[PDB]
Amino acid sequence: MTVSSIASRYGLIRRVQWKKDHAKGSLLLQLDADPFVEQRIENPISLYWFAPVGVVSSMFMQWRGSLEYRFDIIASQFHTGRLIVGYVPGLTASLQLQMDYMKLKSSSYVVFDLQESNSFTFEVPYVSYRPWWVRKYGGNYLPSTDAPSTLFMYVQVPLIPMEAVSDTIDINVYVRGGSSFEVCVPVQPSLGLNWNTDFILRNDE
């Protein structure tokens, strides 16, 4: 039992549809480069999946280190694709827009060709001013910070499938903590179980 024993387990975190007619700049995910990856399940409170590195980050105050996200691009060898997995350090919410692949390739990026091999584990860098990084969510407390950095995934060259196979392709996005991942300060966890999803309000009337 070990933090790095948990952080070396992939957890499936995002289903990305990848169609034929997606253009050569269309966004597939702008998801945050923290372990706290948002996956929403469809109660008056909502429940979420997380990566194991996401939860075991959510039992700590601070985290640092790489984040190896695995892109498993489920296709035949007859499909040919190409897509950037880019990574920009330090984009705020107002800079969450203005994003495309042409402004992405200035930063660090990896172009992949979907061919006879269909899977690659990109290693998200840890690029920040701070040695650690505060938990995104914290306790039930409206102050206490978004991601250090943002991943992006644009379709560099669109899917050109053969006419015997399908127009659409699933892309699964796993999240695993990197080899340099480490967490330090034990604080109040930001996540609770769903054994008892009952909640009681405290209005005063």
Partner 1 sequence: MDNPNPGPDGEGEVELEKDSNVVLTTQRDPSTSIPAPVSVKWSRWTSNDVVDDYATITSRWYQIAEFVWSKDDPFDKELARLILPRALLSSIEANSDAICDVPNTIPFKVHAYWRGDMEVRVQINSNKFQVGQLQATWYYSDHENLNISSKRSVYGFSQMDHALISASASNEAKLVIPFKHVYPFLPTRIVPDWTTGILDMGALNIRVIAPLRMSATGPTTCNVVVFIKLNNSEFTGTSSGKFYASQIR
Partner 2 sequence: EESRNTTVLDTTTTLQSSGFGRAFFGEAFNDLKTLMRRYQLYGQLLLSVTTDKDIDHCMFTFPCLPQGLALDISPHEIFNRCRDGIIPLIASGYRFYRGDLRYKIVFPSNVNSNIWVQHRPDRRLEGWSAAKIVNCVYNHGYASHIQITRVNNVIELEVPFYNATCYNYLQAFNASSAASSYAVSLGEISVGFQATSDDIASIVNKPVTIYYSIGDGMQFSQWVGYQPMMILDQLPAPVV
Which residues of this protein are in contact with partner 1, per CB under 8 A?
24, 64, 66, 72, 77-82, 88-92, 94-95, 98, 101-120, 125-131, 133-134, 145-149, 156-158, 160-164, 180
202 binds, among partner 2, partner 1, none (CB under 5 to 8 A by kind): partner 2
The Cα 28–Cα 19 span in angstroms is 10
The Cα 110–Cα 155 span in angstroms is 12
Q: Of 65 and 161, which CB lies nearer to partner 2 in the complex structure?
A: 65
Question: Does residue 30 belong to the site contacting partner 2 (CB under 8 A)?
Answer: no
97 binds, among partner 1, partner 2, none (CB under 5 to 8 A by kind): none
Going from the C-alpha of 198 to that of each of 46, 71, 137, the distances in angstroms are 11, 36, 21
The Cα 11–Cα 188 span in angstroms is 23
Question: Does residue 204 belong to the site contacting partner 2 (CB under 8 A)?
Answer: yes
183 binds, among partner 1, partner 2, none (CB under 5 to 8 A by kind): partner 2
The Cα 148–Cα 124 span in angstroms is 12
Radius of gyration (C-alpha) of the chain in whole angstroms:
19
Q: Of 23 and 130, which CB lies nearer to partner 2 in the complex structure?
A: 130
188 binds, among partner 2, partner 1, none (CB under 5 to 8 A by kind): partner 2
Residues in 51-90 at the binding interface with partner 2, rule: CB under 8 A: 52, 55-56, 58-62, 64-66, 68, 70, 72, 85, 87
The Cα 24–Cα 124 span in angstroms is 23
Question: Does residue 95 belong to the site contacting partner 2 (CB under 8 A)?
Answer: no
200 binds, among partner 2, partner 1, none (CB under 5 to 8 A by kind): partner 2
- Check if the beta carbon of residue 173 is closer than 8 Å to that of residue 13: yes
The Cα 165–Cα 96 span in angstroms is 35
The amino acid at residue 1 is M
